[PDB]
Design a protein around this ligand. Structure first.
Ligand SMILES: CCCCCCCCCCCCCCCCCC(=O)OCC(COC(=O)CCCCCCCCCCCCCCCCC)OC(=O)CCCCCCCCCCCCCCCCC
Ligand code: HEA
Ligand code: HEA
Ligand SMILES: CCCCC/C=C\C/C=C\C/C=C\C/C=C\CCCC(=O)O[C@H](COC(=O)CCCCCCCCCCCCCCCCC)COP(=O)(O)OCCN
Ligand SMILES: CCCCC/C=C\C/C=C\C/C=C\C/C=C\CCCC(=O)O[C@H](COC(=O)CCCCCCCCCCCCCCCCC)COP(=O)(O)OCCN
Ligand SMILES: CCCCC/C=C/C/C=C\CCCCCCCC(=O)O[C@H](COC(=O)CCCCCCCCCCCCCCC)COP(=O)(O)OCC[N+](C)(C)C
Ligand SMILES: CCCCCC/C=C\CCCCCCCCCC(=O)O[C@H](COC(=O)CCCCCCCCCCCCCCC)COP(=O)(O)OC[C@@H](O)CO
Ligand SMILES: CCCCCC/C=C\CCCCCCCCCC(=O)O[C@H](COC(=O)CCCCCCCCCCCCCCC)COP(=O)(O)OC[C@@H](O)CO
Ligand SMILES: CCCCCC/C=C\CCCCCCCCCC(=O)O[C@H](COC(=O)CCCCCCCCCCCCCCC)COP(=O)(O)OC[C@@H](O)CO
Ligand SMILES: CCCCCCCCCCOC1OC(CO)[C@@H](O[C@H]2OC(CO)[C@@H](O)[C@H](O)[C@@H]2O)[C@@H](O)[C@H]1O
Ligand SMILES: CCCCCCCCCCOC1O[C@H](CO)[C@@H](O[C@H]2O[C@@H](CO)[C@@H](O)[C@H](O)[C@@H]2O)[C@@H](O)[C@H]1O
Ligand SMILES: C[C@H](CCC(=O)O)[C@H]1CC[C@H]2[C@@H]3[C@H](O)C[C@@H]4C[C@H](O)CC[C@]4(C)[C@H]3C[C@H](O)[C@]12C
Ligand SMILES: C[C@H](CCC(=O)O)[C@H]1CC[C@H]2[C@@H]3[C@H](O)C[C@@H]4C[C@H](O)CC[C@]4(C)[C@H]3C[C@H](O)[C@]12C
Ligand SMILES: *N(C(=O)NC1CCCCC1)C1CCCCC1
Ligand code: CUA
Ligand SMILES: [Cu+2]
Ligand SMILES: [Mg+2]
Ligand code: NA
Ligand SMILES: [Zn+2]
Lengths: 98, 84, 43, 58, 514, 259, 79, 46, 227
């Protein structure tokens, strides 16, 4: 009525599928599968934008339920503000792959 | 409906196997019994050159161009009538 | 939009050449067929 | 039967810069050349057939 | 490397480019075909021959303009190029299947050219109605090659639709809802759903025609108990949605061009624009019989179709007025693209309004199969669809190529085309009201003036088409590389430079959920 | 490096060969239908088989072997399959529309009746009912196969999948037999027309579904499927249900109501 | 007799643009009637109405074709 | 990997504006001419 | 028939066509208004240096431009449907004539009493008599009684055709295996023209329809002599 013999993801998942799976296990998100929760966006508590280079395009949905998204490159350095709502964003460079 | 059986507390592999062997296959066996019982070649009907049947607007791209693909001499007459 | 000066500027003379070549590439073949249309209709 | 997926994973992840359709070895190459030849040949053949049918054979 | 890139592509930008090139070439074929039509009608009498060769031309003109020019450019071209960039995607969901959607077109086009080469061609009208399209009135390979061409074009589109819908639903930034995607993205998805649902019915119908012509079936043959009118239903059930498929992506581009050159950060009434495209798309599936008002249907049926067809004016109205509201209070940039978009808003409205005239079964009795219909659809297609393509082309050319066009030349082109198309099609309303039938190689003497002016107008349009080819040459020949582009904060597709690198969004965008 | 979960596919020649195979088959059919030759059609079918084989092979290499199928990539494939089935359904819609159009308003040529004069319909309680119990039963067995695979039972998954395939083949054979025993042909008017073209295409879908199931069978034997990741199987099963459902409609419409 | 026929009058059973059935029905009705009368020893003159009507409505080629088929034994309709 | 930037993300070369003019002229010229010759073809069969 | 440089519809010869001219006038006014309104608004939006680029609210004006068009459509639909149903009214004709489309000519059958029928071909350009219309004259005209309700039945014996006569507001497709009905009623005596309105092959442009409307009396004599 029952038995085994079929591999599991833990035993057989490979490549990127495996990384996502392991990362997910540690509670991490190196492959941007989740949407990051915003901070207060103040000068003091800026939104931390992870990146693997010195700049990353940011999309700002200023107010909830806005249909327009404000896009701009966030550069490494001093925090920058959304040209529309002024909330703060700061790039926090590299790593991901050890 | 709800059928007339029961389980539902947890539909799993054992349950569906139970349905395969206890319901599905037996049903196929009964219809196989019935079918290979009511078969037997039914006397082919008299041929009438009805204009809405045995259509030929272009010959078929096979044979002599006058035989349907799964032509059965015993039951499928040609536009001119049954074959020899 | 802002752009840099033409890397390989196309002078008015050059443009007359491109325009003329372009117009002719459309007009000639067609005109030839159309011209001989009577030579085709009955032959 | 025995599970040989690990072997296949190793073979296909082997960093040799080969596109997945040829990463399985020399056979891939062959099958590809056969497929491509039939496609290109048949296409040429088809162009010929069009040219033939384009003219009346009275 | 060249073959790997252009023949084995799996890159959305390169595939979009291939589509643009194909559509551009196809457009030349369709223009040539249109000129042959107007040449024949330019003066009373017969120029080419009887109605057969003439209608082989009329039929080809339609298939080429519709299936090879408009759809490849708007959906395959702009769609593939812009959609991924607008939602910040690294590419399309099925990049390989996408490549096949493209490669099915040259074969499909080849079958069309074949069809016209063999026998006496297929002089059936793009609707391909039996019995004229049957194996008796059109014996030979022609019609069968035409059906095969449609089949290939259909699979290409269905495959493309599956890809677009999947990409737009599944590959947006995690925080971006559907109500945060650009209107052009919305337009592409809606078009895709229409394609997915309509083309299969068309395919069913042209297959039945194929079997009637080759396997002795009698779907549309009364002798076997078939019905020629069944075909019309199956054709038009796809055919109406198809005209909306031809205009929706244009609506999407117009929304972007109008918003952009109005110096606005967003289009007026975004949600109203979304609702409008969805309603149009829906209504477009329940109005097909307005193409069969004279086949002899019950009066109740004809009353229903008149009503359902007219309702489409409401959502379409919301869009028209919203583009105007988007221009309202803007710092207007009189660019060539804006010009095409403004001509579009006007010319499309005209064609739409005459479409509303035709929706009245009563009046349609007299207008059906006359040049009034030809005038209606050329305003929406040769002015609507085409103007959206031209506006989108000049607006995004710098993005695709990295080079800028000469603005003055583009403005001249616009002006020539504007005169040309209006001179060609406006008089056709007259010919229509006065009774000149469609698909005629010659006409009674009284129709001479308007037919003469119309053909002259078409030559002006030709001058415009030739000029545009040169203008594209000059851009590539001078090489004025792009530096900066305005409004990038609300036009993501420009944010990666001109042209963007082969791979964009390797690192996705950052979007807070808050 | 990419920091997204999406799959960037290696440039492939399959789309081109597939496109060309499409040209060879359509061209081929034309050659067959009008210039009495099957050569083109032969080559077309061949390159097509070759294309499909290699293309899907690569998909298995990219997934089972390379690990490119992250949850996101898989989510997209689900959408793609659902959308594909939808278009296949709409295709059938046209055929059912043709059937109902002809059967609900029989023309004078048929004798103004349905079935037409001179047409003797098969008995829906004979092989058609058998065919029906066969497909329904394969629906139950494929579900047992699915639960077995999810429960990690290799033997029973294989057993159930095998039963499902046998049934699909059984249906195919029964239907071929019926085609031969049928007193009416495809040339027998609009009745023969709608009947064979509809059941014909459905027959083809059954053959394709079966083949898909067979592929899953062999991928199962080779341990490709894990108890949690087996989309190829899921798609084959959705496709199988679709095929089963189209039969129920054909049964009720053409075989039962249409007699 | 109760005749003096101009043309086939409006028939509430076939009120729409498609009259195919109207012609067909009347053709059938006439040949059915003509049959029963020629059968039970009666006068075919009673069937006169249906002949006038189907004559008016039916295209000559349809009637001709139908007549040829009744003779050939291949008429699909039940008479 | 492939060439990137202006004049490199295309299947034809824009290195020489005259060579390019020639390409384009064949490209679009061929498309435009096709119908005319097919018409001639049809008239020359009968 | 149409005259040189014609802009609108050929003059109404039946009550129904008259009805349609009036309905078309009504419709055309709305079309003109709306289109010129849109063109005006376009120019208004583009002729001011004043600007307002901030977010504008839509749930208010969308009411306006939803309810207005809806009203306008109802203003078109009402008279349109009134006329549609008017065309479907039961009328009880005095005569029934059939026409069969053929590649490429029309055949007519007046079989109410006698079995009268004839083919109607276009008069070749080369055989036209002085003053005759090119592409429009036929050898045998469709003689019909004026001021009488006639039932026209249309069908075809080959491909599709469409029987049309603009001055009377008629166009009924000729479909093989099908018998389409339409009613004809000319308010005046005369010659009324039309052309095949469905693509039917090589000579689709050359198979006109010419009706000859005369008083009942002359129609009768004509019947007799056409035996
Ligand atoms: C090219 C040939 C022209 C021939 C002209 C007439 C000669 C008359 C002699 C002598 C005139 C007097 C004696 C005869 C009276 C006959 C009345 C009749 O039987 O009545 C019915 C007739 C005649 O209708 C007329 O009563 C003529 C109306 C003409 C309106 C023209 C707008 C033109 C704009 C620019 C020029 C044309 C090209 C661009 C058109 C661009 C799209 C409109 O047939 C129509 O229905 C034709 C139009 C169909 C519908 C098109 C609808 C939307 C069109 C334009 C909206 C523009 C708004 C902004 C205002 C316009 C902004 C641009
Ligand atoms: C998109 C569709 C489309 C377009 C643009 C056009 C454009 C034109 N059409 Fe027509 N036409 C049809 C679709 C179209 N048409 C259809 C479906 C029919 C009916 C078929 C049937 O009856 O069966 C028809 C019928 C038809 C008739 C009626 C035939 C008859 O009844 O006998 C006439 C008559 O003059 C005509 C003329 C023209 C002319 C002169 C143009 C000119 O305006 C064209 C001028 C040139 C262009 C507008 C091309 C521009 C676009 C490009 C070249 C892309 C360029 C490249 C890049 C931007 C990258 N067309
Ligand atoms: C881009 C392509 C396109 C588009 C979008 C449309 C849109 C419309 N079409 Fe048309 N149509 C065609 C392409 C197109 N059409 C083609 C190709 C044919 C002929 C096919 C053939 O036979 O070969 C055709 C044929 C055709 C017919 C058949 C005519 C006949 O053969 O007798 C009808 C019938 O009703 C019709 C109706 C409409 C209507 C009501 C619209 C509506 O969607 C338009 C709605 C738009 C507006 C109304 C304007 C904007 C709105 C406002 C400013 C609001 C206020 C308005 C009011 C209150 C009225 N079209
Ligand atoms: C065993 C059950 C499964 C059925 C299919 C198996 C074998 C047949 C070969 C291909 C069938 C595939 C699809 C169906 C196409 C046509 C209908 C076929 C259904 C069928 O097989 O019908 C047969 C007719 O064969 C005929 O003509 C068939 C002639 C064969 C040539 C095929 C014609 C090719 C046309 C295909 C069109 C392609 C378009 C599809 C495009 C899809 C979307 C783009 C029935 O036999 P019969 O003798 O008339 O009557 C029985 C009397 N004893
Ligand atoms: C008389 C006619 C005769 C012909 C009849 C013939 C046959 C009958 C018809 C059908 C029977 C056939 C097969 C049925 C069996 C299986 C189908 C597979 C369904 C399945 O099992 O679906 C699953 C869940 O539901 C989901 O997809 C839900 C998500 C769906 C996404 C795809 C849809 C997107 C397309 C456009 C959207 C439509 C928008 C609606 C609003 C419009 C208002 C007008 C898989 O998950 P997923 O995709 O990751 O989604 C995540 C959401 N949970
Ligand atoms: C069948 C055909 C149908 C015909 C169509 C008829 C067209 C409708 C005509 C008029 C619409 C009237 C809307 C009235 C809105 C007021 C405009 C205004 O002035 O716009 C804003 C309002 O926001 C807002 O509604 C947002 C801005 C304005 C919102 C509406 C503007 C768009 C109006 C349409 C644009 C023209 C296109 C018409 C289409 C035909 C200004 O904001 P406030 O003053 O609070 O702040 C400024 C600071 N203060 C307080 C110190 C002054
Ligand atoms: C008259 C005769 C007309 C003949 C016309 C024939 C036209 C083409 C014939 C040749 C096509 C067959 C070759 C195989 C095609 C497979 C497509 C496929 O399987 O595409 C998949 C996506 O669609 C999915 O899933 C879900 C959807 C799968 C769709 C499968 C393709 C079916 C084609 C439909 C055409 C049917 C024609 C009608 C025949 C009766 C995979 O996506 P890719 O982009 O590849 O990769 C993405 C990677 O992440 C994978 O790891
Ligand atoms: C669907 C839910 C929305 C509900 C709204 C209703 C819309 C459609 C459903 C109704 C279908 C049944 C109605 C039949 C009843 C009338 C019987 C009849 O007789 O109609 C017949 C045709 O119906 C036929 O095939 C009808 C054939 C079907 C045509 C409908 C097209 C839509 C199909 C696509 C939808 C995709 C769905 C996906 C499936 C899961 C013939 O026409 P008549 O004009 O009579 O000719 C007789 C003359 O001699 C006298 O005038
Ligand atoms: C006589 C018989 C010949 C008749 C012609 C048609 C022949 C065969 C059609 C049968 C279809 C076979 C399809 C096999 C697909 C194998 C690839 C597959 O199943 O690929 C799977 C993805 O889904 C995917 O692309 C899903 C792919 C879906 C494709 C199914 C669509 C059917 C297509 C029919 C096209 C016919 C075209 C005919 C043209 C004229 C791989 O992902 P998983 O399974 O999760 O694996 C990963 C795990 O191992 C990780 O641990
Ligand atoms: C709808 C699109 C088409 C628009 C109309 C085309 C516009 C004009 C194109 C001119 O092209 C040509 O002109 C000729 C005449 O001027 C031709 O020469 C021909 O005529 C001669 C002079 O009369 C000869 O010298 C040569 O033998 C000769 O073939 C002919 O070859 C052709 O290329
Ligand atoms: C879109 C999906 C489907 C794509 C198209 C479907 C392709 C169907 C192929 C049909 O091909 C065939 O054609 C034949 C005809 O050439 C056969 O041979 C036959 O035909 C003859 C040649 O005249 C005879 O010699 C023989 O008896 C024999 O039956 C035959 O068996 C069969 O394989
Ligand atoms: C046109 C189509 C039949 C196509 C065919 O003959 O195959 C038929 C089928 C059912 C009909 C619909 C339904 O019968 C319901 C409605 C009935 C009303 O009297 C007219 C509109 C109405 C909405 C119909 C319009 C049209 O005549 C439909 C949609
Ligand atoms: C509620 C929904 C979306 C609003 C949102 O969540 O942002 C909006 C978007 C478009 C609106 C519709 C469109 O504006 C068109 C119509 C306008 C009329 O003012 C009311 C109904 C009307 C049909 C609207 C109803 C409703 O307010 C809709 C449907
Ligand atoms: N389903 C399928 O892809 N059908 C198509 C038919 C054309 C229109 C869109 C849907 C099946 C795939 C395998 C072969 C048989 C058809
Ligand atoms: Cu007869 Cu057109
Ligand atoms: Cu439509
Ligand atoms: Mg028509
Ligand atoms: Na002419
Ligand atoms: Zn912001």
């Amino acid at each position: 009525a029952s038995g085994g013999g079929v591999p599991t993801d833990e035993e057989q998942a490979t490549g990127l599928e495996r990384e996502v799976m392991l990362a997910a296990r540690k509670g991490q998100d190196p492959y941007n599968i989740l949407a990051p929760k915003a901070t207060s966006g103040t000068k003091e508590d800026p939104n931390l934008v992870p990146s693997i280079t010195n700049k990353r395009i940011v999309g700002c949905i200023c107010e909830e339920d806005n249909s327009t998204v404000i896009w701009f490159w966030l550069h490494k350095g001093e925090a920058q503000r959304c040209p529309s709502c002024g909330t703060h964003y700061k790039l926090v460079p590299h790593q991901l792959a050890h | 409906a709800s059928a007339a059986k029961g389980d539902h507390g947890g539909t799993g592999a054992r349950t569906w196997r139970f349905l395969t062997f206890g319901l599905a296959l037996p049903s196929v066996a009964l219809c196989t019994l019935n079918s290979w019982l009511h078969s037997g070649h039914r006397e082919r009907p008299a041929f009438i050159p009805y204009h809405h049947l045995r259509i030929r607007t272009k010959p078929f791209s096979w044979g002599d161009g006058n035989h349907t693909f799964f032509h059965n001499p015993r039951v499928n007459p040609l536009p001119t009538g049954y074959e020899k | 939009i802002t752009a840099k000066p033409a890397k390989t500027p196309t002078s008015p003379k050059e443009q007359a050449i491109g325009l003329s070549v372009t117009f002719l590439s459309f007009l000639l073949p067609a005109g030839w067929v159309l011209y001989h249309l009577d030579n085709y209709k009955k032959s | 039967f025995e599970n040989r997926v690990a072997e296949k994973q190793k073979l296909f992840q082997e960093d040799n810069g080969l596109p997945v359709h040829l990463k399985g070895g020399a056979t891939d190459n062959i099958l590809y050349r056969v497929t491509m030849t039939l496609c290109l040949g048949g296409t040429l053949y088809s162009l010929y057939c069009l040219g033939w049918a384009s003219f009346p054979h009275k | 490397m060249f073959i790997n890139r252009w023949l084995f592509s799996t890159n959305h930008k390169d595939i979009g480019t291939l589509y643009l090139l194909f559509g551009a070439w196809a457009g030349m074929v369709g223009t040539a075909l249109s000129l042959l039509i107007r040449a024949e009608l330019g003066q009373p009498g017969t120029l080419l021959g009887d109605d057969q060769i003439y209608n082989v031309v009329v039929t080809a003109h339609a298939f080429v303009m519709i299936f090879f020019m408009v759809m490849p450019i708007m959906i395959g071209g702009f769609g593939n190029w812009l959609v991924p960039l607008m939602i910040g995607a690294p590419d399309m969901a099925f990049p390989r299947m996408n490549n096949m959607s493209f490669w099915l077109l040259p074969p499909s086009f080849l079958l069309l050219l074949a069809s016209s080469m063999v026998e006496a061609g297929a002089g059936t009208g793009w609707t391909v109605y039996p019995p004229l399209a049957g194996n008796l009135a059109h014996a030979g390979a022609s019609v069968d090659l035409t059906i095969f061409s449609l089949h290939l074009a259909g699979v290409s589109s269905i495959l493309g639709a599956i890809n677009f819908i999947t990409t737009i639903i599944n590959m947006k930034p995690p925080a971006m809802s559907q109500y945060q995607t650009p209107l052009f993205v919305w337009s592409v998805m809606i078009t895709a759903v229409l394609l997915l649902l309509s083309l299969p019915v068309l395919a069913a119908g042209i297959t039945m025609l194929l079997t009637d012509r080759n396997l002795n079936t009698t779907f549309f043959d009364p002798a076997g108990g078939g019905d020629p009118i069944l075909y019309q239903h199956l054709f038009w059930f796809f055919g109406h949605p198809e005209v909306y498929i031809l205009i929706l992506p244009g609506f999407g581009m117009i929304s972007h061009i109008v918003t952009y050159y109005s110096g606005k950060k967003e289009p007026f009434g975004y949600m109203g624009m979304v609702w409008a495209m969805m309603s149009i798309g829906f209504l477009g599936f329940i109005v097909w019989a307005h193409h069969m008002f004279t086949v002899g249907m019950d009066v109740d049926t004809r009353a229903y179709f008149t009503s359902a067809t007219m309702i489409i004016a409401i959502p379409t109205g919301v869009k028209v007025f919203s583009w105007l509201a988007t221009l309202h209070g803007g710092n207007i940039k009189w660019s060539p693209a804006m010009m095409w978009a403004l001509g579009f808003i006007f010319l499309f409205t005209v064609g739409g309004l005459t479409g509303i005239v035709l929706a009245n079964s009563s009046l349609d009795i007299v207008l059906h199969d006359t040049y009034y219909v030809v005038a209606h659809f050329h305003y929406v297609l040769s002015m609507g669809a085409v103007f959206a393509i031209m506006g989108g082309f000049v607006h995004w050319f710098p993005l695709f190529s990295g080079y800028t066009l000469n603005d003055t030349w583009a403005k001249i082109h616009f002006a020539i085309m504007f005169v040309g198309v209006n001179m060609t099609f406006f008089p056709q309303h007259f010919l229509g009201l006065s009774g000149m039938p469609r698909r005629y190689s010659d006409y009674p003497d009284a129709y001479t003036m308007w037919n003469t002016i119309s053909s002259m107008g078409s030559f002006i349009s030709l001058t415009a088409v030739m000029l545009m080819v040169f203008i594209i040459w000059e851009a590539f020949a001078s090489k004025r590389e792009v530096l900066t582009v305005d409004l990038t904060t609300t036009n993501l597709e420009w944010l990666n430079g001109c042209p963007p690198p082969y791979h964009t969004f390797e690192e996705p965008t950052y979007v807070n959920l808050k | 490096h990419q920091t997204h979960a999406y799959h960037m596919v290696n440039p492939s020649p399959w789309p081109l060969t597939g496109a060309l195979s499409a040209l060879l088959m359509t061209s081929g059919l034309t050659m067959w239908f009008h210039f009495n030759s099957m050569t083109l059609l032969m080559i077309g079918l061949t390159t097509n088989m070759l294309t499909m084989y290699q293309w899907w092979r690569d998909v298995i290499r990219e997934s089972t072997f390379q690990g490119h199928h992250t949850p996101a990539v898989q989510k997209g494939l689900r959408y793609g399959m659902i959308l594909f089935i939808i278009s296949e359904v709409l295709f059938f819609t046209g055929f059912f529309w043709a059937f109902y159009h002809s059967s609900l308003a029989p023309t004078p040529e048929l004798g103004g009746c349905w079935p037409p004069t001179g047409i003797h319909p098969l008995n829906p309680l004979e092989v058609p009912l058998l065919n029906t119990s066969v497909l329904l039963a394969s629906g139950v067995s494929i579900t047992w196969a699915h639960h077995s695979l999810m429960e990690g039972d290799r033997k029973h998954m294989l057993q159930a999948l095998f039963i499902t395939i046998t049934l699909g083949v059984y249906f195919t054979l029964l239907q071929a037999s019926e085609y031969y025993e049928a007193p009416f042909t495809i040339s027998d008017g609009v009745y023969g027309s709608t009947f064979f073209v509809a059941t014909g295409f459905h027959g083809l879908h059954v053959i394709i579904g079966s083949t898909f199931l067979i592929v899953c069978f062999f991928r199962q034997l080779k341990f490709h499927f894990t108890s949690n990741h087996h989309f190829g199987f899921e798609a084959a099963a959705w496709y199988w249900h679709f095929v089963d459902v189209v039969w129920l409609f054909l049964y009720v419409s053409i075989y039962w109501w249409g007699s | 007799k109760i005749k003096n026929y101009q043309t086939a009058p409006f028939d509430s059973r076939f009120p729409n643009q498609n009259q195919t059935r109207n012609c067909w029905q009347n053709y059938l009705d006439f040949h059915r009637c003509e049959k029963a009368m020629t059968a039970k020893g009666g006068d075919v003159s009673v069937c006169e109405w249906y002949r006038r009507v189907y004559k008016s409505l039916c295209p000559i080629s349809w009637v001709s074709t139908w007549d040829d088929r009744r003779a050939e034994g291949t008429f699909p309709g039940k008479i | 990997h492939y060439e990137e930037g202006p004049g490199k993300n295309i299947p034809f070369s824009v290195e020489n504006k005259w060579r390019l003019l020639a390409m384009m002229t064949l490209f679009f010229g061929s498309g435009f001419a096709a119908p005319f010759f097919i018409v001639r073809h049809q008239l020359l069969k009968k | 028939m149409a005259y040189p440089m014609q802009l609108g519809f050929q003059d109404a010869t039946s009550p129904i066509m008259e009805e349609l001219l009036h309905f078309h006038d009504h419709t055309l006014m709305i079309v003109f208004l709306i289109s010129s309104l849109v063109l005006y608004i376009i120019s208004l939006m583009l002729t001011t240096k004043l600007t307002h680029t901030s977010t504008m609210d839509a749930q208010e004006v969308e009411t306006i431009w939803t309810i207005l068009p809806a009203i306008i459509l109802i203003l078109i639909a009402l008279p349109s449907l009134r006329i549609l149903y008017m065309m479907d009214e039961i009328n009880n004709p005095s005569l029934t004539v059939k026409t069969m489309g053929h590649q490429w000519y029309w055949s007519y059958e007046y079989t109410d009493y006698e079995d009268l029928s004839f083919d109607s071909y276009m008069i070749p350009t080369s055989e036209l008599k002085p003053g005759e219309l090119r592409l429009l004259e036929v050898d045998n005209r469709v003689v019909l009684p004026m001021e009488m309700t006639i039932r026209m039945l249309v069908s075809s014996e080959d491909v599709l055709h469409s029987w049309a006569v603009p001055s009377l507001g008629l166009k009924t497709d000729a479909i093989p295996g099908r018998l389409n009905q339409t009613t004809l009623m000319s308010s005046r005596p005369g010659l009324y023209y039309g052309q095949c309105s469905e693509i039917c092959g090589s000579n689709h442009s050359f198979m006109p329809i010419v009706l000859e409307l005369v008083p009942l009396k002359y129609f009768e004599k004509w019947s007799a002599s056409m035996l």
